[PDB]
Amino acid sequence: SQIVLPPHLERIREKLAENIHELWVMNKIELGWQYGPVRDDNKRQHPC
């Protein structure tokens, strides 16, 4: 709570989250998971 974030680290954090979400999309499309509203295996379509 008390520590202060450098602006450059926050700016690269945005693209870090972008890259994490990109790994999510690639790994789940490998998994079979696709365009989806919610984490629902019955429709087998995936939010990320």
* Residues in contact with 5: Cβ distance below 8 Å, sequence separation at least 6, in sequence order: 13
Within 6-48, strands assigned E span: 34-35, 45-46
| DSSP-based three-state secondary structure for 2 | coil
Q: How many CA atoms lie within 13 A of 43 on its CB side?
A: 10
State which approach was used to obtain the coordinates: cryo-EM
C-beta atoms surrounding 33 within 10 Å: 18
Report yes or no: 36 and 45 within 8 Å, Cβ to Cβ.
yes
Dihedral angle over CA of 31, 32, 35, 41, nearest 10: -90
Q: How far apart are CA 2 and CA 39, in angstroms?
A: 34
**Resolution of the PDB structure in angstroms:** 2.6
